[PDB]
Amino acid sequence: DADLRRLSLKNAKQLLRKFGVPEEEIKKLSRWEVIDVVRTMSTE
DNA sequence: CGTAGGCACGTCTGCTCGGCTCGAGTGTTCGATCGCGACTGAGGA
């Protein structure tokens, strides 16, 4: 979680692109929301 | 010769004691949120 916070908007965006997250969530460009989704995607 | 006064079982009576269940009552542990300070990207001076 702290590691995901360090990940920064640029690399978490690229990770959400890699997992196949839809472009709306990538688009909102909210780092805090993006990390919560990426943590959920990793948990899945 | 007869004829009424003492010995074994059977079943019930009653009290004592020990054990088992069971639920009320009380203390102990552990996840489930609440709040605080802080982390960390973010659009305007």
Curated annotation (Swiss-Prot):
Coiled coil (residue ranges): none
Entry's localization field: Nucleus
PTM text: Phosphorylated by casein kinase II in vitro.
Quaternary organization: Component of the TFIID basal transcription factor complex, composed of TATA-box-binding protein TBP, and a number of TBP-associated factors (TAFs), including TAF1, TAF2, TAF3, TAF4, TAF5, TAF6, TAF7, TAF8, TAF9, TAF10, TAF11, TAF12 and TAF13. Interacts with TAF7; the interaction is direct. TAF1, when part of the TFIID complex, interacts with C-terminus of TP53. (Microbial infection) Interacts with SV40 Large T antigen.
Disease: Dystonia 3, torsion, X-linked: An X-linked dystonia-parkinsonism disorder. Dystonia is defined by the presence of sustained involuntary muscle contractions, often leading to abnormal postures. DYT3 is characterized by severe progressive torsion dystonia followed by parkinsonism. It has a well-defined pathology of extensive neuronal loss and mosaic gliosis in the striatum (caudate nucleus and putamen) which appears to resemble that in Huntington disease. Intellectual developmental disorder, X-linked, syndromic 33: A syndrome characterized by intellectual deficit, delayed psychomotor development, delayed speech and language, and characteristic facial features.
Notes concerning its domains: The Bromo domain mediates interaction with histones that have acetylated lysine residues at specific positions. The second domain also recognizes and binds histones that are butyrylated and crotonylated.
Family designation: Belongs to the TAF1 family.
Function: The TFIID basal transcription factor complex plays a major role in the initiation of RNA polymerase II (Pol II)-dependent transcription. TFIID recognizes and binds promoters with or without a TATA box via its subunit TBP, a TATA-box-binding protein, and promotes assembly of the pre-initiation complex (PIC). The TFIID complex consists of TBP and TBP-associated factors (TAFs), including TAF1, TAF2, TAF3, TAF4, TAF5, TAF6, TAF7, TAF8, TAF9, TAF10, TAF11, TAF12 and TAF13. TAF1 is the largest component and core scaffold of the TFIID complex, involved in nucleating complex assembly.
Protein name: Transcription initiation factor TFIID subunit 1
Residues of the full protein shown: 1013 to 1056 of 1893
